[PDB]
Amino acid sequence: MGGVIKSIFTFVLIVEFIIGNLGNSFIALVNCIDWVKGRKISSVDRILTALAISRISLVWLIFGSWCVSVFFPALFATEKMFRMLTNIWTVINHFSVWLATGLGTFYFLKIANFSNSIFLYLKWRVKKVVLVLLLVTSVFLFLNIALINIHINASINGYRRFSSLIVLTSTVFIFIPFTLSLAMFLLLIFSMWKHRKKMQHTVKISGHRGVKSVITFFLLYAIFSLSFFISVWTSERLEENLIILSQVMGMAYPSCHSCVLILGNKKLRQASLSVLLWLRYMFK
Ligand SMILES: Cc1cc(C(F)(F)F)nc(Nc2ccccc2-c2nnn[nH]2)n1
Ligand SMILES: Cc1cc(C(F)(F)F)nc(Nc2ccccc2-c2nnn[nH]2)n1
């Protein structure tokens, strides 16, 4: 039963790798092309391309880790790699997750409207707010690095793997930005619903159009949240082949969330449709 599970996990990891690579590469390439040929890019475009760069870095790191675990695994068994690779992974993943959270904050501030003066101040200071949020969050990165390093050092000292708790720490420190992003998304949905309710009563229908793209983000949130809920249960519930399971699980968000951005964004959606129609045309 182990062999079939391992093969299925490897295949799903391979498809995740290729899909994430192609999606993030498409995002970065279209943004760079539009930058080169005039087309003054927007702040959202800059954030999207930076996120794509971070995600391609993360997927390359994870795929290299998998290759090292497959080819000459003796190197992977070394403690030095166990420490260095996880440190670089946590740094890159923290930066990527908080960049995504910054994109969400930019959306929430730019689009949503409220009567609370604090919200108005953050709304009109949005550009400095997101940059400070990215800079101030570095304290979380340093604390995560210190905690993971001390935990692995203690585990090694006791030994002279114990990933059930390192993965727990990673999940705990990944839920922190995710909860804020979910709360902000719910707040924006509430704002849009209230705006449309108020618009449908006084103003006639002839006069919150983003609900069309809200459906896909809800699906992504649900799927990723279910996978993460399964993660904590599986970390202690059963089995011990967590290396491949964790290696595939940690690559879902940067591999699939990018496609959601592609469909949710008008520019990326138009680029995807143009690519599809160009593929059709060249076929002749
Ligand atoms: C591909 C790879 C290899 C390694 C390792 F080489 F360091 F093992 N780590 C990780 N990062 C994780 C990401 C998500 C969940 C868990 C870990 C995790 N497992 N063990 N340590 N961190 N991803
Ligand atoms: C591209 C796009 C469009 C829409 C729309 F449906 F409102 F138009 N919504 C989102 N999502 C968010 C919305 C608010 C706050 C944060 C996120 C978020 N968090 N993580 N990723 N995006 N994104």
UniProtKB/Swiss-Prot annotation:
SUPFAM superfamilies cross-referenced by the UniProt entry: Family A G protein-coupled receptor-like (SSF81321)
Gene Ontology annotations for the cellular component aspect, listed alphabetically: membrane; plasma membrane
Record comment: activity regulation: Basal activity is enhanced by binding to bitter tastants, such as flufenamic acid and aristolochic acid. Regulated by cholesterol in a concentration-dependent manner.
Annotated transmembrane regions: 8-28, 56-76, 88-108, 130-150, 172-192, 214-234, 243-263
Membrane topology classification: Multi-pass membrane protein
Complexes and interactors: Core component of the TAS2R14-GNAI1 complex, consisting of TAS2R14, GNAI1, GNB1 and GNG2; within the complex interacts with GNAI1. Core component of the TAS2R14-GNAT3 complex, consisting of TAS2R14, GNAT3, GNB1 and GNG2; within the complex interacts with GNAT3. Core component of the TAS2R14-GNAS2 complex, consisting of TAS2R14, GNAS2, GNB1 and GNG2; within the complex interacts with GNAS2.
Protein known as: Taste receptor type 2 member 14
